[PDB]
Design a protein around this ligand. Structure first.
Ligand code: MG
Ligand code: ZN
Ligand code: ZN
Ligand code: ZN
Ligand code: ZN
Ligand code: ZN
Ligand code: ZN
Lengths: 103, 103
DNA sequence: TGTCGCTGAGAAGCGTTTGC
DNA sequence: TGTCGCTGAGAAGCGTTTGC
């Protein structure tokens, strides 16, 4: 059931993907088929989300929506998508989601 | 992929299952279809194996073969199968398998 | 510009495997 | 009477969800 984690190279990141980053939480488009889930807000939407570059990372915990990364971690998805060494907050051990800050 | 954990009641344990407990490791029958895996020796065989009674337990880590439970933990599968309150060594946190004693 | 609860999740088994 | 290495594993998303 675990969705495979695939590292998208920074040179392979499209400007269409960059412009499809969500800016306002309430303006999201839910899609049970093509959408992706943000680890923080746990909403499966079509807006572009971050991609963890840690080889040992797995699953969906590296995917964060636009609003979530800039409000819970003070970082921009556009910078994380083009960051060669970006690790998700779970990898950094700084995730403050409902689950992570309890466990 | 996780095999569901089902608690077999002690009153529902068959004498045929009891007599099918493995006694010698080298006299095991491998079966990729009907066999079960022992958490300790990691062999999928048809010999009767233990069943953890912990409700929060999951997966295969509660299944131990005859030789493994009596050689690594000094306990008998026949006693564990009829024990109302038996928890597997992983639940007791005393598992000494190759993986558990490292992590 | 905004978030958590809840279910169900939380591997398993072949291969290179058997104590001195 | 006997055991470990190795791959691949290690959730995800709807519902009861949006900061004052
Ligand atoms: Mg799974
Ligand atoms: Zn989010
Ligand atoms: Zn990560
Ligand atoms: Zn988290
Ligand atoms: Zn065994
Ligand atoms: Zn158990
Ligand atoms: Zn173990």
């Amino acid at each position: 059931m675990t969705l495979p984690h695939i590292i998208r190279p920074v040179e392979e990141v499209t400007e269409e993907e960059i412009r499809n980053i969500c800016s306002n939480s309430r303006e999201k488009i839910y899609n049970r088929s093509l959408g992706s889930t943000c680890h923080q807000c746990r909403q499966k939407t079509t807006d572009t989300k971050t991609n963890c570059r840690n080889p040992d990372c797995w699953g969906i915990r590296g995917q964060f929506c636009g609003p979530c990364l800039r409000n819970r971690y003070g970082e921009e998805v556009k910078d994380a998508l083009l960051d060669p060494n970006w690790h998700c907050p779970p990898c950094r051990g700084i995730c403050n989601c409902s689950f992570c800050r309890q466990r």
